[PDB]
Amino acid sequence: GFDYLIVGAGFAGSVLAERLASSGQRVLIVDRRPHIGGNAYDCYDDAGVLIHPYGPHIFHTNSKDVFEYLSRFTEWRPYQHRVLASVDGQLLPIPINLDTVNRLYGLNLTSFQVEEFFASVAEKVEQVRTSEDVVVSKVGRDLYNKFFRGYTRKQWGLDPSELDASVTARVPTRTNRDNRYFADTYQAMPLHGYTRMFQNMLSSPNIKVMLNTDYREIADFIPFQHMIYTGPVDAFFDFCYGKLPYRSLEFRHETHDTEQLLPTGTVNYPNDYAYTRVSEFKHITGQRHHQTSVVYEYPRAEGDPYYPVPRPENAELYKKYEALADAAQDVTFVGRLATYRYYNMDQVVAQALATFRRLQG
Amino acid sequence: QESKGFDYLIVGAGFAGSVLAERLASSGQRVLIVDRRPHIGGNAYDCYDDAGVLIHPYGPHIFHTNSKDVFEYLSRFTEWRPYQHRVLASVDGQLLPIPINLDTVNRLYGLNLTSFQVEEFFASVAEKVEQVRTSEDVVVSKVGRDLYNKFFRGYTRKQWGLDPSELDASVTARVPTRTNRDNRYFADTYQAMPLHGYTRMFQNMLSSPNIKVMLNTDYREIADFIPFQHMIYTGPVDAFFDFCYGKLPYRSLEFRHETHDTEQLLPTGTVNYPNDYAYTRVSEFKHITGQRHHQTSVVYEYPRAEGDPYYPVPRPENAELYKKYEALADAAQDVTFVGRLATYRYYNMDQVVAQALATFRRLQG
Numbered sequence: 001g002f003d004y005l006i007v008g009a010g011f012a013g014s015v016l017a018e019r020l021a022s023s024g025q026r027v028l029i030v031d032r033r034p035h036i037g038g039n040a041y042d043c044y045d046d047a048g049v050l051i052h053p054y055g056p057h058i059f060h061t062n063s064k065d066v067f068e069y070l071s072r073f074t075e076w077r078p079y080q081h082r083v084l085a086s087v088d089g090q091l092l093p094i095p096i097n098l099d100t101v102n103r104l105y106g107l108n109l110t111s112f113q114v115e116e117f118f119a120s121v122a123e124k125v126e127q128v129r130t131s132e133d134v135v136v137s138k139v140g141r142d143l144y145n146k147f148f149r150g151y152t153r154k155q156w157g158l159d160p161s162e163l164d165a166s167v168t169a170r171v172p173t174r175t176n177r178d179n180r181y182f183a184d185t186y187q188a189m190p191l192h193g194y195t196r197m198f199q200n201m202l203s204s205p206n207i208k209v210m211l212n213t214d215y216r217e218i219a220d221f222i223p224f225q226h227m228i229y230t231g232p233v234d235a236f237f238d239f240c241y242g243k244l245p246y247r248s249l250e251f252r253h254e255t256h257d258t259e260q261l262l263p264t265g266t267v268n269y270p271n272d273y274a275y276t277r278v279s280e281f282k283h284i285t286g287q288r289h290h291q292t293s294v295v296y297e298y299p300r301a302e303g304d305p306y307y308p309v310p311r312p313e314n315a316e317l318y319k320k321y322e323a324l325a326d327a328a329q330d331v332t333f334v335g336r337l338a339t340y341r342y343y344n345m346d347q348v349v350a351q352a353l354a355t356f357r358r359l360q361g
Numbered sequence: 362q363e364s365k366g367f368d369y370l371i372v373g374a375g376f377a378g379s380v381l382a383e384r385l386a387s388s389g390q391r392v393l394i395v396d397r398r399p400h401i402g403g404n405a406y407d408c409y410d411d412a413g414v415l416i417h418p419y420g421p422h423i424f425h426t427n428s429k430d431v432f433e434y435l436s437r438f439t440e441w442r443p444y445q446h447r448v449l450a451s452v453d454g455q456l457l458p459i460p461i462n463l464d465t466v467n468r469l470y471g472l473n474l475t476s477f478q479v480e481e482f483f484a485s486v487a488e489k490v491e492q493v494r495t496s497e498d499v500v501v502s503k504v505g506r507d508l509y510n511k512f513f514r515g516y517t518r519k520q521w522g523l524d525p526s527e528l529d530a531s532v533t534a535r536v537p538t539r540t541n542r543d544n545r546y547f548a549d550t551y552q553a554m555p556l557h558g559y560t561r562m563f564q565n566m567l568s569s570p571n572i573k574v575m576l577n578t579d580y581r582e583i584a585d586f587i588p589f590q591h592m593i594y595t596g597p598v599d600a601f602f603d604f605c606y607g608k609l610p611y612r613s614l615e616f617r618h619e620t621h622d623t624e625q626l627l628p629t630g631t632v633n634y635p636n637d638y639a640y641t642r643v644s645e646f647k648h649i650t651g652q653r654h655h656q657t658s659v660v661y662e663y664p665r666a667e668g669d670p671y672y673p674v675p676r677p678e679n680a681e682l683y684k685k686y687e688a689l690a691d692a693a694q695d696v697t698f699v700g701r702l703a704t705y706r707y708y709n710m711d712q713v714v715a716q717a718l719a720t721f722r723r724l725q726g
């Protein structure tokens with residue numbers, strides 16, 4: 001048999017599969033999807049363009065440890081993602097910065113001046129709890145309306161006041177002129193795509209890969225010691241406490257007969273269209289092609305779980321599940337879905353590494 | 362008694378495995394298809410390289426068949442790009458057509474024979490053979506010693522490490538000799554490449570919920586604890602029976618892939634080198650895939666003794682060794698052998714598919 005049965009071949013499951021196997025363990029990693037990599041899986045479309053079938057996946061981290069780790073399995077294309085937001089018929093920097101405010105209102109404030117201007121408009125909040133509070137308390141009611149309110153309502157189906165502060169706190173507000181989506185120390189894409197990096201990661205002879213397979217389809221007749229489950233929690237426990245909310249997305253992919261379609265990798269639509277944004281994969285990968293491929297993101301209530309929904313009622317409901325999980329003797333939970341945390345890739349990696357260390361000492 | 366488990370454990374994700382998996386699953390059987398490699402499709406696997414060029418890591422794979430049955434079957438899993446492969450052979454510093462034909466003869470010897478003449482020409486140089494048995498017989502008896510030496514003897518010696526006389530007639534008889542001006546490598550009814558590659562086609566083929574795909578796994582690593590009713594084996598026969606009769610010869614290959622900053626390196630899909638270099642041939646994938654790209658990627662093939670089994674070696678000595686293993690296989694109760702490696706048959710893609718499909722109809726009987 002195996003020492004470990006890992007459910008989910010994304011970062012959480014693949015990072016652990018790699019570490020355990022590098023330390024002698026015999027690992028069987030399985031996934032219900034026909035491919036590995038989970039959400040970060042990438043492949044070439046019919047036109048021969050490299051794309052992310054599950055939406056834009058830009059790698060960024062502040063962890064020297066995380067970056068040096070991945071570096072063992074892939075070279076890097078230096079890349080700092082940038083996003084424009086379609087507001088009032090323009091394409092403006094988001095996160096909001098000096099340039100956003102100046103171009104929108106036709107002002108000419110310096111950075112020093114825009115700090116006072118924000119001050120003069122930000123609503124005061126006794127205690128910031130909601131996604132509305134974080135933004136409104138920093139940059140006033142108007143900017144909140146034009147950049148965050150609409151987008152949030154469309155993405156989650158919930159007003160920012162029905163969401164925890166951490167959600168819209170992901171996008172910081174700047175008084176400077178930095179226009180990168182991330183100020184992280186390390187920002188780079190795997191030179192030949194995520195999938196390629198996962199294959200290196202899972203190359204050990206100590207790793208058996210099983211695809212197109214629900215773990216429940218084999219758990220009964222396959223000898224294993226410990227289980228590492230990276231799927232959704234509520235599903236692991238047959239939805240015993242009811243359905244734990246997970247927001248989902250639909251992706252409509254297109255290929256155009258032109259080299260470039262967008263000014264940058266991603267354009268957000270806070271106040272227009274059904275989709276939240278369009279992305280162009282050549283901006284992100286650096287691939288050269290006579291054509292180009294893009295993807296439109298439509299928020300959905302039903303579908304494969306991609307987003308936990310951070311808010312009081314869901315935090316509580318998860319705690320019920322967390323209780324069962326912590327009780328689950330021979331099963332360790334890790335990942336964005338398994339532990340219900342709005343995590344980026346690097347964060348999942350860290351959580352995985354840390355989980356590996358405990359399982360080791 | 363223990364678990365019932367999978368109805369079928371299938372070893373190999375090549376055409377032999379995949380076709381039986383799809384057929385079995387579609388019929389309602391639970392299948393676990395396993396392969397020691399980290400990908401499906403066996404030799405026919407294809408992928409994009411670092412440059413973004415669709416290539417065949419295991420050498421050039423051109424699909425051709427005369428079986429309508431087979432073509433329509435594979436058509437269920439992929440659209441087609443019509444392609445008719447054309448090889449050139451480097452002889453006397455020239456690039457001449459092979460199969461040998463009217464143009465090959467005329468251009469090589471600077472002749473002006475008509476089709477009707479090249480027939481009399483061949484007749485006049487052919488060596489007679491009481492009974493054709495070797496690869497030397499099939500050729501020499503048709504186009505003569507000189508053409509044989511120039512197009513076959515050197516190539517064959519390099520590919521197999523054996524003189525054509527040390528190989529069965531069936532080996533070189535694969536390449537027809539022509540009196541017409543056909544320069545196609547195949548004259549089959551249906552010649553086309555899978556529009557988006559073989560891998561895409563295989564994914565559709567193993568996509569059923571009834572099929573579980575296991576990669577990076579030698580069946581021996583699991584056949585001890587995973588329950589299964591019947592096994593379909595598609596690897597080398599001798600290895601299945603622990604070489605209890607000794608190593609069955611299989612020829613291997615080393616592939617050297619290159620990418621060049623040009624649009625096109627070769628006049629055709631493949632160029633053969635019967636009398637030059639270590640490698641037997643070079644191939645440019647864009648000719649075969651139809652892909653558009655500012656660069657191009659090619660593969661050189663180097664015949665090898667040691668390595669992964671790619672070719673059975675048809676000759677009396679080996680046919681005699683295989684026959685013993687064949688009896689073992691025929692005795693194997695809950696084991697079905699099918700494919701190029703598992704039945705020791707020099708088969709093309711379309712042939713293996715056909716053999717799998719037949720195997721399936723028998724299983725369903």
Ligand SMILES: Cc1cc2nc3c(=O)[nH]c(=O)nc-3n(C[C@H](O)[C@H](O)[C@H](O)COP(=O)(O)OP(=O)(O)OC[C@H]3O[C@@H](n4cnc5c(N)ncnc54)[C@H](O)[C@@H]3O)c2cc1C
Pocket residue numbers: 007008009010011012013030031032033037038039040054055056057058059060213214215216230231232249306307334335336337343344345346348
């Ligand atoms: C649209 C989108 C864009 C994103 N962009 C970025 C970005 O730009 N930068 C960034 O850092 N992060 C981004 N992320 C977040 C990033 O994708 C996650 O941090 C990371 O993918 C989480 O990895 P994971 O392994 O924990 O979960 P996953 O990657 O989802 O892997 C979990 C796997 O578990 C499998 N599974 C679940 N249940 C079962 C079961 N029952 N049986 C078998 N298999 C099962 C699933 O099929 C899935 O493949 C983005 C996420 C989304 C949705």
Ligand SMILES: Cc1cc2nc3c(=O)[nH]c(=O)nc-3n(C[C@H](O)[C@H](O)[C@H](O)COP(=O)(O)OP(=O)(O)OC[C@H]3O[C@@H](n4cnc5c(N)ncnc54)[C@H](O)[C@@H]3O)c2cc1C
Pocket residue numbers: 372373374375376377378395396397398402403404405419420421422423424425578579580581595596597614671672699700701702708709710711713
């Ligand atoms: C260089 C080259 C070029 C070719 N070109 C053409 C062509 O142009 N046109 C054409 O029609 N045909 C071509 N062929 C032939 C074609 O590849 C074969 O007909 C076809 O691939 C045979 O399929 P198969 O499934 O029977 O064997 P394979 O495709 O080899 O699949 C067998 C699989 O079994 C796996 N396996 C074996 N033992 C084990 C084990 N112990 N545990 C787990 N897995 C195991 C192997 O890893 C392998 O993937 C070519 C072959 C080669 C080598």
Ligand SMILES: O=c1ccn([C@@H]2O[C@H](COP(=O)(O)OP(=O)(O)O[C@H]3O[C@H](CO)[C@H](O)[C@H](O)[C@H]3O)[C@@H](O)[C@H]2O)c(=O)[nH]1
Pocket residue numbers: 056058081083085094147148149150151152155167168169170171181266268270344
């Ligand atoms: O223009 C915006 C952007 C965000 N928000 C709000 O702030 C939240 C967080 O925004 P994220 O971009 O971080 O949310 P995503 O998961 O949808 O985006 C993913 O894709 C992006 C690519 O553009 C980034 O790389 C990001 O880190 C990555 O997790 C949103 O849910 C929303 O409530 C807006 O109101 N307006």
Ligand SMILES: O=c1ccn([C@@H]2O[C@H](COP(=O)(O)OP(=O)(O)O[C@H]3O[C@H](CO)[C@H](O)[C@H](O)[C@H]3O)[C@@H](O)[C@H]2O)c(=O)[nH]1
Pocket residue numbers: 421422423446448450459512513514516517520532533534535536546631633635709
């Ligand atoms: O120029 C040649 C070609 C062949 N032979 C001899 O005849 C045999 C049969 O030749 P193949 O080309 O058929 O050998 P392969 O299996 O290596 O070829 C594979 O690669 C080819 C790519 O051009 C074709 O697609 C072919 O059908 C495919 O199975 C060779 O082994 C050799 O003995 C030659 O002497 N000279």
